């Protein structure tokens, strides 16, 4: 998963 997608999902 790209960084922004991963951060969006987590937060």
């Amino acid at each position, epitope marked *: *998963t*790209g*960084h*922004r997608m*991963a*951060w969006d999902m*987590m*937060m």
Partner: antibody, heavy 125, light 110 residues
Framework: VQLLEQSGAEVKRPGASVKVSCKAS????????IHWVRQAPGQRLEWMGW????????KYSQRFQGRVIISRDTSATTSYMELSSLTSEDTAVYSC??????????????????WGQGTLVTVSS | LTLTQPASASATPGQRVTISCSGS????????VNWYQHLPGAAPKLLIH???LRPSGVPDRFSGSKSGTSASLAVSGLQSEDEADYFC???????????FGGGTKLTVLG
């Protein structure tokens, strides 16, 4: 000023478990992810995992999955990293860092900042 | 995984020095590079985020660039206080987590 303050140095025997703490202040604790990383003597930093302190959702590196638990206490604005089944390979400085995340207006990534001072864990028989 | 940096870099005061970080399509290729200064006994200090942006407080003599799967930190008008370890960091799409360079010890010659 934002601070992440970590628990003190620990000495553990092989097969034991260690729990390191990271006390946050100076910002809204539940609004930013916390990451845990470690660095063994002579080696590079290695990422272990992260947690959304708002809901407790934690995710881990496949290298540690199954023996690390990252958690938080929101009333104490503290995150914890527990690592089980210790061996001498686990001797390292364990550090937390705050994810400033992405700027919602610009899309820029803002960085992992600040970082805790680290907690040395020594595993020895 | 791994980002690759030279073990050391050095220059005289006033000179410009560059430190490189090499990675792969799944980290530096697709995500931003972020650089930290590490001084003895102190937590890492963010110097550059999002490839080339300086946080508040960071002197304008520090700059960053990224191109393809590589990136560079440049320090111009080198001062003795700049002697430190510098390391790069980027999200890795395969790890779904952060990867870090091994660090470069910058010596200010003299």
């Amino acid at each position: 000023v934002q601070l992440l303050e970590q628990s003190g140095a620990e000495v553990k025997r092989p097969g034991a478990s260690v729990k390191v703490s990271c006390k946050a202040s100076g910002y809204t604790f539940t609004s930013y992810a916390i990451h845990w990383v470690r660095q063994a003597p002579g080696q590079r930093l290695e990422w272990m995992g992260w947690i959304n302190p708002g809901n407790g959702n934690a995710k881990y590196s496949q290298r540690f999955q199954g023996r690390v638990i990252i958690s938080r206490d929101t009333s104490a604005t503290t995150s914890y990293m527990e690592l089980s089944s210790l061996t001498s390979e686990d001797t390292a400085v364990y550090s937390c860092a705050r994810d400033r995340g992405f700027d919602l207006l610009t899309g820029h990534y803002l960085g992992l900042d600040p970082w805790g001072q680290g907690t040395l864990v020594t595993v020895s028989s | 995984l791994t980002l690759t940096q030279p073990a050391s870099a050095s220059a005289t005061p006033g000179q410009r020095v560059t430190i490189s970080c090499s990675g792969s399509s799944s980290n530096i290729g697709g995500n931003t590079v972020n650089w930290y200064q590490h001084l003895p006994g102190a937590a890492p200090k963010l110097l550059i985020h999002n490839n080339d942006l300086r946080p508040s407080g960071v002197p304008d003599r520090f700059s960053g660039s990224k191109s393809g799967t590589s990136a560079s930190l440049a320090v111009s008008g080198l001062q003795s206080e700049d002697e430190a370890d510098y390391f790069c960091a980027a999200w890795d799409d395969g790890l779904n987590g952060w990867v870090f360079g091994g660090g470069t010890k910058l010596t200010v010659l003299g």
